[PDB]
Structure formats: C-alpha cells, structure tokens
C-alpha cells in the first residue's frame, strides 16, 4: 500500500531536496557530474569545448594578421611575409584554427617563419588541443564502460517465494545471469524496508534491516552460471520469524535485494538492485526448474524462469509457531 | 557418468535458451555486448562506422558542390570560389570526406571561406570524428585488457587426491601461477556440483555446495608465488564426510575449484576455474613436490606439477568411519 | 584542546619530514607521483615534453639541411634536391618538426625522397610523437578520474551524538549521498583516536582503536539511499564504555570516521572521512529526520540533515554504569 | 641460514624451469605479457608495427604505381592521372604510406580520384592506423599506471621485535606511507615460511603458515596516515607460541609481511611485501616514536621509523612458558 523504496527494475525511488550547495559541489567533483549527464549534453559540452577553442584562436590570428597588414597581402611577395598565409579575414583565421587544433593542416592556409608570436600561438594551440582530446577520450571511454548497464542483462524473479526447503522455512527469490560472460566475485544481499518506532520513542522514516542470506560463511558469495534461487532461512534472528501467510497478506514492508560482481571484461563493480512488496511475495510457492540435462551439456530454459507451482503442505503459521508448537 | 558444468579448462558447459527479450537487453548494455564479440566482428562494427561516416559527409560535400556549380568549375577562377577547391565528382568528395575526418588533409581538396554550411560541416565532421575514433580507443582498450585471459598463465592440477594431512583426511588440488608477475588479492573457492532431492520433495537440477578451504579464518586468502596444494579437511561439516573410497570409485559428482585474483599490472580481477569428476580424484595419493632450494635461490620444476604419487597408508574408510570407529 | 588528527572536511593534518630518498622513490613511481601534482605543473611538464622534443627534431633538421646545401636552396631545383623542401633556417626547421610530430604537416615544409636520414628521422619523430602523446592521455585520464573527488559529493554530519536506541546507549552519526548515482559496495569505519601509555610504560603517540560499528556481522556494509544514522553500540568491548556524559565534556579524544565505497560509473573506490572531536559530540541528542513519503515517491529535506533536538531523557552516566547499577 | 624466500624489498626468490608449453600460454595472454616486458623490449614491439605496416602499404601502393605507368608519370598531365601524385619510386609510396597512416598528410604525394584499389587502400590503411594507434595507447597507459610501483613509496621496517604490550608477548613491525596521497582499503598479512614433515611423513619444502595480525575482528584493516606497528599477539595459536629468545637466536625461518591497498588516485591496488628472518627479529626490543605534536599540527620524523631501543624487563622465554608458568 505503501509506495516502494525501490522500483522492480532497480531505480531508487527517493528525490533529494534543499541541497543548497550543490552546485559547488558538483563543480569540485567535475568528472563524476560529466560522465552521469546524459550523453547529449557531455556530447554537447566537449562541441562547445572545440568551437571556443577554435573561435579564440580564430580571433588571435586574424588580430595578428590585421596588425602585421596581411588582411591586405594575404599570399604575400618578394618584399612581404605574412605570419600565416591565407589569412584574408575571419573566417580564413577560423578555418587556420580549426585546421591547427584537429591537425587537419589542409596546408592553403599555412604559418610562415615571420612573426613569432604567430609560431608561439601554433605551439600553444597544438598542445591546448592535445589537451581537450585527453579530457574528451576520458570522459567518452568512462561513460562507456559504466557498469551499472550490466544490470540490464542480469535478471531477477518477478516475484519472491516463501516455502520449506530442508526443514526450514525459507524467503527464496531467483537471479540470473543473461550472457554467456560471468559476473566475477558475485555475491548477494538483501534488506527489509519499512518504518519503525523504538522502544524510546524515535520515529525512523525506513529502517533497513538485513536479510541473512549467509554472509557469516561466505554463502552470500555465489558461482553464478545457471539460475540460483538465493536463500533466506527464516529463524529467530530474521525479522520475518513471527510472520505467519495471513500477516504477510495483510503487511506492508518491502524486500530490497541486490546482486554485486564485476563485469568480466573491464572488472568493474556493477550493482544489480530489485524489490520485492510484501504483495509481491508467493507464500507456499517454489520456483519451476529451468536447468536439465541434454547429451553432452546443460541447458537453461528462461521461459521458465520467472513461474512458481504451489506447494499446498507449506505450514501457514510463522516460523515462530513452528518453533513454539513443536 | 552425468556430464560435467564446468570443462577442465574452465569453460562452462551450460546453453541458455528461450531468452526472448535479448536483443534489446545486449542493446542497452552495448558496451558490454561489443567487448564480448570477437575481435573480428567488432573491428568490422567500427570500420563500418568510419565507413558510413565518411560517405555520409561524402553525400553531404558532393550536394554543397553539386548545387554551388562546383563541380563545373572545381579549381575556381577570379570571378568564382568554390566552397572546397577540387571537390569535381563522388569520388573526390568521398576523398575530401576521408581527409577530413581521418585529419590526413592532404589539402588538394580544400575548404573555402566561401560557404558558411561547408565551413559549418568541416566543424561537424572534425568533432564526430573525434567522438568515433574516442569510442574506438575505449573499446579496443578495454577489449586489450580482458583479464579472463590470465587465467591461460594459471594452472590447476589435472587431479585432485584424497589423502591425510596433519591427523585430518584431506581434498587437495594444487594451483599454480606461471609467470614472475604477481596474482594479488588472491583467493580460493571451491563446490561439490550434484543433482539433489529436499525432504519436501522438491528436485534440484544442480545443487552448488561450499567445499570449505578456510573462508572462516581468511586462510581462503593466500600467497601465490610457487605452486600451493589448496586443503578441504574432510568433517562433520563437509559434503564428503560419509564418503569412502569405494564410494567415490562408483558415485556422481563434480568438484568446481576456483581461483581469483588481480592481474598485478592492472589490478583487475581474473577468475580461473577447473574441475574434478568424482572419477578424477585419486584416493590415497600425494602430490610430487616441484619446490627445492639451490645456491641462492629456490626453483621449481614444473614438469612435476601433476604428478602423483600412492600413499598406501591411507585409510580407505570415510572420514565419518574414522570418527566413528575412534 | 590537543589539536586533531583529520579536519572536519577529511584532511589529515600530518606532516612528514627527514625522508631523505624521497626524490629517488618519488622518481620510481613517477607515474603516482606525475597524478598527484596539481594540474598547472602536470599540464606544464607536458607542455615541456613537447617543445623539448620538438625543439630537438628541429635541431636534427636544421643540422641536415645545414650540411645538404640546402639552407642555400631550400626550395630546390632541376639539379638540386633538399632533404626537406623550405627548410631556410632554425625557425623553419623547427616549424617542420613541430607539424611532423603533431601531424598537422601544413606540407609547404615537406621530406623528401633525396636524404635516407631524412626519411629515418620522420619516422623516428613519427613514432615518439605517439609516445608522448600516449603518456599524455593516459595522465590526463587517470587525474581526471581521481575518485577522491567523490567525497566532495558525500556529506557526514557535523556532529555526532549519543542516545538510547532499542535499549542500548549509541554513538551515532550520519551520512549522506548528494548525488543520484551510487555508492557501489559501500561500508562504515570509526576508529578513537588518542595518546596511551601502556602497562609497559610504552608511550604511544595516538593509538588508534576501532569502533565496532557492525564488521562482524556484515552491518558495516550500508546500502545507501537517503542518508543513514552510522550506529557505535557502546557496550562492554567499546572503548567508550566508561565514558559518561561530564567525562565527555571535560575528555580529549577524538573520533575519526570513514566511508569506501565505488563510485558508480567507474566502479574506483573513493574513501570519504571527517571527524569528531569529544567537544563536537553531543550527549543526548538525536537527529531529524530528514526522509518523509509525499504521494508517488520518497523524498530528502537535507536542510535538516545536520539538525539535532534534545532527549532529556537520556540516561547521563556510562555504559558500564548502566550494566553495574542493573 | 637458508636463503630467503622473499627478499627486504619484496622481490621473490624462487625461479620457475621446465614450463614447456610457456610461449603458447603467453600468447594466448598477449597483453598481459606485453605490459610485463620491460619498457624497451615493448616500445620496439610498436615501433616494429608501425615499421611493418607503412612497409607493406608502402610496397601496395609502389604496385599500384609500377602497374598503373605512374612511375613515369608521376605528376601527371592532361591525358594522364596518377592513382596517386608523385609517387615515382619505392621511398616516395614508402613516404606515402607514412604520411598516410601517421595523418602527417604533408600533400605532395597525394591521392587521386582515379584509381578504386588506390582510394580503397587508403581507406584500410586509415582503418588500420587508428587499430594499431589504439593497441599502443592502451599498452602504454597499462604499463604506465602498474601499482606495484606504488610500494616505492611505502615502507616496512628493516627489523621486526618481539616485546611486551599490554600483558602479552607481540611480534612486531612497522609500516609507514611515504606520500600525502592515501593507500585506500588497506590491509595487512603476514606468514611464517618454512620447510616441513607432516605426522604422516610427507615433506613441504616450504609450507606457508598464517600469522594473525587481526582478520577475524577486522583490524588486519588499517587506516594509514602516520607510521603504524603492527602487532602479532604470540598466543596458543600462534606458531611462534614455543619459541623462546635463545629459540629465536638459534632457529631457522622467515616470517613475510604484506600490505595491501588501493592507489588513491587509480583505486588500483598494489600488494607491498618485506621479509624478516629469524636473525632479523630483534627480541627485547621496542621502535623510537617518529610522530609528535607541534602548535597546529603533527609530524613524522622518518630519521627514527628503523630505530629501536632494548626493554630489559622483557620476559626471555616463551609466550608459553609464560602461561605455563603462571
Ligand atoms: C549539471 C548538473 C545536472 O544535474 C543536476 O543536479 C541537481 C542536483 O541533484 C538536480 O537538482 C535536484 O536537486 C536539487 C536539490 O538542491 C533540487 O533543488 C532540484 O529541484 C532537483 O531537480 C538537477 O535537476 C540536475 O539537473
Ligand atoms: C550481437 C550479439 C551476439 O551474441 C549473440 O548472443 C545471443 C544471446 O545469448 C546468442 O543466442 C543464444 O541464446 C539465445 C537465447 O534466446 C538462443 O535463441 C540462441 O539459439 C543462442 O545461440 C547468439 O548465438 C549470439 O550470437
Ligand atoms: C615533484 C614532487 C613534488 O612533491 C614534493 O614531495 C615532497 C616529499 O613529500 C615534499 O616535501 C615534504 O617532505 C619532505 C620530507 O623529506 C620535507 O623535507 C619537506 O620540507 C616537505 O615539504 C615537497 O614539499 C613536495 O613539493
Ligand atoms: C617474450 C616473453 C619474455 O618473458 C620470458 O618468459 C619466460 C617464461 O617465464 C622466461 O623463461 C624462464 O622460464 C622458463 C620455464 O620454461 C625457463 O626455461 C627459462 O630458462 C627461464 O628464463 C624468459 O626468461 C623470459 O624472457
Ligand atoms: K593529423
Ligand atoms: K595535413
Ligand atoms: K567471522
Ligand atoms: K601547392
Ligand atoms: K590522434
Ligand atoms: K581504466
Ligand atoms: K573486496
Ligand atoms: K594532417
Ligand atoms: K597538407
């Protein structure tokens, strides 16, 4: 009822307010604002980077050009060099300047051995274009390579499952990965949302309060080929042991979960989130297979993936009751 | 018998199917999708992008000149200029288009000041061409650097051995690192990989059951420099602790053994994987040493690495049996 | 009163002096060294590099056309051919090195096919132009990225405060994310840190001793949203334990705190700190909320995020005070 | 006695032979190799590619000329176009190809709308050039950002003690950071190397045995700003548990020391390893503080970071002597 921390595709569901300083902010961490604006405005920010580089350069020649008098003997004689041939008005001081800083150097319009502060401008142009490409292959490759994209080819359940699994009742939900490129040092976890008032009387907005799912023994680390349902054992120590199938049909919180590893080609975190409501978990439910066996391999049928099948002897009560009346 | 999830060489021996939305997932996450193709296919994505560029901006030159009368008069005269010199044909605006973009600019081929949109284009074409060869650079780089390839300067045993160590019945394999620079961060993981029935009822196609080799103590956690024998004690706790000779000669299973670390010159992490088939543990054997000390120096010879070697002393009995006859 | 070991903005105000062989370590690892500098001495050092390579090639040049004749007839003709058409003088030389190495080559200075040293020199220039060129990418690149910069984008609060939570006495203090994108594998440290002397009678400067705030359990490791209270239990194994509220008023010590994590789009740990004085923690107090539920979404009002409100409440001993008079 | 595993400054001492199948493997892990040879070996590989490439197009377009007359007519006329101007040798279509592939573009030799094979090849070339500029780039900016050489800035001490603190017997050393910039994530290991006999009769040349510096509480993980001792409490899990100061003075080992951390500019990590034999451990004996207070701030002296001093009153016999005893 409640409307959710997380959305199902991952996106957080939180908008920051009153954050007076942050332009500030955003300016003396540069780098990470320009790689997480969209790729139009980075894009459009390194043309304009280009055009006034170019436009500054272009108005330092042709002033060099008006002073020395080559707007009025552009291709010089005998008796008369002009600093850059060519230069005959704006938009040929332009083009030299464009021309210099890609190093297209068409060559018709070309720096000669006269003026020195015109070679000492094409030594400084050269190496202030230098400079601008750095900043701009940087920028480009790092928001290409932005692993959270990896997130768009792992998959979680639709939905979370509560059922018996070797004697215990276990909050079970599925991950998998939808290339043939693993996910290296993979490992899960989980949390439970909602708000809470202490025995002192402080309101917490959303608590978050974690779901074991075996960190203590390294279990959370998982080898993730085929799909894996993850485990919740629901014990005295879980926030869900005295949730029975009527309690949880009639609550409201909502189970964060999340997948971490590193993409296999660049070894980058990436962090694979999703959400589960409380109407959104299958009590007495188990997942279909999708693995079997073929002739001399394995096979995963991801049609499957996401389907439950009711299990009718799954007890109703909590996990405390099942304690408490045996 | 039942064949293996993971190849001895490490690869994974899964096929996933019916994964219907892929395209448009390996879309979204293209960066990943790109560097995962084969070298062959995606120089060929890139050559089409320089291609496709070149002859658009081509198109665009060939209509600036078809329409100004340039191709009529190319090299112009006193009374006309062309907006680029020489551009008398397709083929010569393809050139101007290469030349431009690639920055060769030769410079037979020419713009002009004469026409706003072709100077206006020259700017266009420098900036995109920037933007392609940038994303270029970053995919290759990143393809380069792919550090699964470490793994072909990691070696495991060919088999793993069942003997005792130190009062305990011992897993061990052996890993090795094959070259002088280092694996750092370096860690093991294994898994008994096998089919398994709950008490509820439910079928596991393939259960993933932890091998302890430390985790606990952060004795997982090692320093490869010459060739480590990796130990499971056998206890109460290990999925092999009922397990007798006898039984390994005649069961089905699969031992995934993992080895991760950072490749020391990029710090970015490999993960190297081989496997045992219950039919490729050898009970009752040790390892042959490769490590001896000389002048010096200590030295290893790799030419012992697998070999093996019978321990007839080995009990033949579980390590269940050995508790329990004690 | 005794002056603090890191500045409220992560600073660590430490001095180092008497390295001797700092220069040739530094030299070393130039490449750490080259990244840590500020950007006007990095930017110059490369500016440096160029015109020194240039200024060297222009030389070489020079020397060539100076024995060739060519200075006499730098244009050539029927029975005369430079090395390199209008190399007249050293400007000019220097002039074809420059467009040579940046790739520009304008083309009115141009090799010719006449001297095998010559042509030799421009693909040797040819050749250390990429290389230069290649270390100036990949410094511009790495200093850009420095993920420091993300702690400017991470916000602790000014003070920390102490207060009942569930029943136990609690150090807090709290953190916060001013961006959208995340904190990827993100996780809490706290160390006391002050001068001890032990039962040896050893002195130890500032002895720095942790403050347990979850590690053993994996609750050091936050998933960060809307900004989260950090929580110290102050219990038995606490080295606050004895403190009571006029002990922290009249105490000296000081309590530094840590936030790791990767920043997102390029998965490089960043490590965000403050501190807080004992004058800087406040006894009885608890935060605002800054987190509240608007109509299809959660929202953060951070003008409040530093905003604390008295709890008389509050128990004034100790910890230990608490446990011995139950 | 027995020469050491891994020498003072963390170099390893052991050299790999018989690893017959090496090339292929190497090969196979092309850039791992090529970012591990040495400087001047890897910069000869890429000049070579350059070489070989602007041959082999060199030779293609010499063909072209050869068969197409242009060698007699290499500035064309009215009835005769050249597939490219001034080609009228092997020098001047090897000028070409540089020209080309570099994007020098000087323009005397330049190519013509005439000929289809010679507009394509400089279409490959262009391709081609930008692969193998991609390829070296990448390398270069691999090799120059290696982290290893980052511990060239930090520091273990020459000699490790074993003194009393805080009621027990402690191996110790120290470690200290050379630079203002931070090694993040930083954590320390430590090992005790030597050969070994099992119970069962096996021999281990060198088995690898853990030191506790704090893993299992999480203060194996240090926050580096002034120099830090490292403290090895000697416990009934140590293995230096029997050993006693006449022991030490009279036995065989090595104990090899790590820290391991991020590089804060790269968030790469490097692994820094030192070594102290059994003959290098000084019992009895405590390090010289280096870091006092000032006015506004602290300094390290780094004069004193390898200086110790004797404390008489240390117990000679061994921690479990110590316990024994008592
Ligand atoms: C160039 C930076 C672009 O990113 C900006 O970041 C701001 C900081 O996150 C956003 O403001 C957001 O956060 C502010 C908090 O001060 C609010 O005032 C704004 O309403 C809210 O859109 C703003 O939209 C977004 O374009
Ligand atoms: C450009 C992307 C190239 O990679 C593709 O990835 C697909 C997705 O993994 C593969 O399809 C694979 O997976 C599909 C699952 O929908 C099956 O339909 C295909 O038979 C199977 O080859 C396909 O071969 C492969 O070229
Ligand atoms: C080029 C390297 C620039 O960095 C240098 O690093 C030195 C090494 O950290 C600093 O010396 C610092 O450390 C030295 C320790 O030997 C002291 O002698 C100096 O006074 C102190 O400024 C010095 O300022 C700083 O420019
Ligand atoms: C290009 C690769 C350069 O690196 C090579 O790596 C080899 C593999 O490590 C080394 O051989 C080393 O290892 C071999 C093991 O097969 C021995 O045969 C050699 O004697 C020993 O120098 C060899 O020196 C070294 O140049
Ligand atoms: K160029
Ligand atoms: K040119
Ligand atoms: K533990
Ligand atoms: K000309
Ligand atoms: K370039
Ligand atoms: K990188
Ligand atoms: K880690
Ligand atoms: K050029
Ligand atoms: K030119």
């Not at 030594?123 to 940087?138: E, H, L």
Request: net charge negative; with cysteine; hydrophobic share 45%.
């Amino acid at each position: 009822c409640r409307n959710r921390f997380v959305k199902k595709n991952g996106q957080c569901n939180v908008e920051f307010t009153n954050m007076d300083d942050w332009p500030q902010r955003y300016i003396a961490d540069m780098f990470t604002t320009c790689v997480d604006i969209r790729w139009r405005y980075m894009l459009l920010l390194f043309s304009l980077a280009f055009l006034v580089s170019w436009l500054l350069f272009g108005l330092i020649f042709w002033l060099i050009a008006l002073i020395h008098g080559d707007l009025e003997n552009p291709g010089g004689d005998d008796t008369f060099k002009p600093c850059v041939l060519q230069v005959n008005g704006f938009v040929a001081a332009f083009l030299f300047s464009i021309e210099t800083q890609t190093t297209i150097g068409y060559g018709f319009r070309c720096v000669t051995e006269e003026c020195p502060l015109a070679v000492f401008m094409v030594v400084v142009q050269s190496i202030v274009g230098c400079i601008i490409d750095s900043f701009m292959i940087g920028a480009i490759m790092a928001k290409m390579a932005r692993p959270k994209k990896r997130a768009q080819t792992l998959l979680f359940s639709h939905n979370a499952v509560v059922a018996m699994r070797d004697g215990k009742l276990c909050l079970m939900w599925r991950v998998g990965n939808l290339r043939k490129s693993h996910i290296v040092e993979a490992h899960v976890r989980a949390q439970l949302i909602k708000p809470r008032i202490t025995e002192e009387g402080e309101y917490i907005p959303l608590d978050q309060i974690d779901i074991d799912v075996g960190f203590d023994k390294g279990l959370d680390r998982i080898f993730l080929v085929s799909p894996i349902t993850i485990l919740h054992e629901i014990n005295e120590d879980s926030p869900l042991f005295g949730i029975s199938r009527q309690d949880l049909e009639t609550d409201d919180f909502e189970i964060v979960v999340i997948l971490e590893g590193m993409v296999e080609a660049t070894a980058m975190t990436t962090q694979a989130r999703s959400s589960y409501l409380a109407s959104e978990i299958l009590w007495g439910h188990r997942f279909e297979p999708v693995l079997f066996e073929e002739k001399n391999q394995y096979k995963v049928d991801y049609s499957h993936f996401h389907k439950t099948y009711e299990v009718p002897s799954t007890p109703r009560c909590s996990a405390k009751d099942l304690v408490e009346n045996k």
